[model samples]
Target: GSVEKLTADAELQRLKNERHEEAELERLKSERHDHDKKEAERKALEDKLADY
Candidate 1:
């Protein structure tokens, strides 16, 4: 029936949304890791300068 069709469409949409969210989450994690690595490098440079 038409109701079954609607239910199926809704489930598909929900899955699509979940996939988009997971991708975004992974992108954010990668960005954060890059940021942290740069920060650590900067700190090391600062320490080396202070030693002079």
Candidate 2:
């Protein structure tokens, strides 16, 4: 009975770790996505003026 309880606790810890990592990954992805969008907008502006 004790061993089974401990096994469940271990799995719970692993799941929490996974959840924390997923949150961090999502934040990083959001930052990168914003950076890409801004960069594209900048390039588009520059391209519009290329004829000058």
Candidate 3:
């Protein structure tokens, strides 16, 4: 019973760590999405210059 309790606590810690890592991943994905959007706009501007 003692070992079972320890095991359960360890599993809980692991789940908490996983949740924290996933949150960081979501933040990075949002930042990357914004960067990609800016790059797209820059490229569109450059392409429009070819009309001259």
Winner by TM-score: 3
Local accuracy of candidate 2 as per-residue lDDT tens digits, 1-52: 8767758888888999999999987776656556654564344344544566
Name the Cα RMSD for model 3.
9.5
lDDT of 1 by residue, 1-52 (tens): 7767758888888999999999986776666556654554344344544566
Where model 2 places Cα greater than 4 Å from the true spot, the runs are 1-5, 37-52
Model 1 residue 42 CA deviation in Å: 21
Write down the TM-score for model 1. 0.54
Check candidate 2 and list the clashing pairs: none
**Per-model tally of clashing residue pairs:** 0, 0, 0
TM-score of each: 0.54, 0.53, 0.54
Error at 44, model 1, angstroms: 24
Candidate 3 lDDT over residue span 1-52, tens digit each: 8767758888888999999999987776566555654564344344544466
Q: Which residues of candidate 3, in runs, are more than 4 Å off? A: 1-5, 37-52
Where does candidate 1 have its weakest 10-residue lDDT segment? 40-49
Candidate 1 segments whose C-alpha is farther than 4 A from its true place: 1-6, 37-52
> Model 3 misses residue 39 by how many Å?
7.6
